[PDB]
Design a protein around this ligand. Structure first.
Ligand SMILES: CNC(=O)Nc1cc(-c2cccc(-n3cnc4cc(C(C)(C)C)ccc4c3=O)c2C)cn(C)c1=O
Length: 263
């Protein structure tokens, strides 16, 4: 629990599912981002209990939770500040002119974070480039893991809603609500596709409804031009029709390290 007397609010970073997010300073020294949780957007009591478990998730490639302010409304979530913002927008900036080794390093950063979460049996449920952030050193970290469980908005939580992450979901999530480690693995393969496509929307010429149908037929995202055969094999292995045949994050990490050594 952070004392709000130790926070200063300096600039607005944007808005997400729980409302406004600000940049500021904690204890007059540390850069932080601060979510100001919009009334009615969050299952607050449930989140407050989970915040304890979430305080114990700590990894170099996960956005670090610093604390919460819960003795007030709106509640605050205080985290590490990531100077270069969301990965999706960062990929879309042509000026970066990324080498493919830099793209594979971004995939490795995310894979490391997800292998850690997998080892804690903790699902993200909304893994995508829009929910990764980039720091001032260009390191990618995974953000907002586990928080989808507290979203109140039916358009996000329903499979047929306008905000549901359809294009990052495997068939068994869309058809049956079967969430598992293997649904995060599917989403990770879509994220590698976003990275190697420099931020294109997956299934960019289809609607959500048409995407669910294309994937139920066994068809998949095409290889991005910048992805080698080996890189495409890795992302494609995340999209096996049978969930139990998709790799673990530990296997994916080994596969990515092998490709780094090879290429
Ligand atoms: C320029 N640098 C920056 O902008 N840095 C940063 C931007 C944000 C930021 C700003 C606006 C909105 C959101 N955002 C986005 N997606 C979200 C998704 C969810 C789920 C539950 C739907 C997954 C919940 C909250 C959010 C949310 O707060 C974020 C993370 C957070 N942090 C730590 C930064 O360092």
């Amino acid at each position: 629990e952070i004392d709000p007397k130790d926070l200063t609010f300096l600039k607005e970073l944007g808005t997400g599912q729980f409302g406004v997010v600000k940049y500021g300073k904690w204890r007059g020294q540390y850069d932080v981002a601060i979510k100001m949780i919009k009334e009615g957007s969050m299952s607050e009591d449930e989140f407050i209990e989970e915040a304890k478990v979430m305080m114990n998730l700590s990894h170099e490639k996960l956005v670090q939770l610093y604390g919460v302010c819960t003795k007030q409304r709106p509640i605050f979530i205080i985290t590490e500040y990531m100077a270069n913002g969301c990965l999706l927008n960062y990929l879309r900036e042509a000026r970066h002119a990324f080498q493919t080794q830099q793209l594979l390093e971004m995939c490795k950063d995310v894979c490391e974070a997800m292998e850690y979460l997998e080892s804690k049996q903790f699902l993200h449920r909304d893994l995508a480039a829009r929910n990764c952030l980039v720091n001032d050193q260009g390191v990618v970290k995974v953000s907002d893991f586990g928080l989808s469980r507290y979203v109140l908005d039916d358009e996000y939580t329903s499979s047929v809603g306008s905000k549901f992450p359809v294009r990052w979901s495997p068939p068994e999530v869309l058809m049956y609500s079967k969430f598992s480690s293997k649904s995060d693995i599917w989403a990770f393969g879509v994220l590698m596709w976003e990275i190697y496509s420099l931020g294109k929307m997956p299934y960019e010429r289809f609607t959500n409804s048409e995407t669910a149908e294309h994937i139920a037929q066994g068809l998949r995202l095409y290889r991005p031009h910048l992805a080698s055969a080996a890189v495409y094999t890795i992302m494609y292995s995340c999209w096996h029709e049978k969930a139990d045949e998709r790799p673990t994050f530990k296997i994916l990490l080994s596969n990515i390290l092998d490709v780094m050594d090879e290429e």
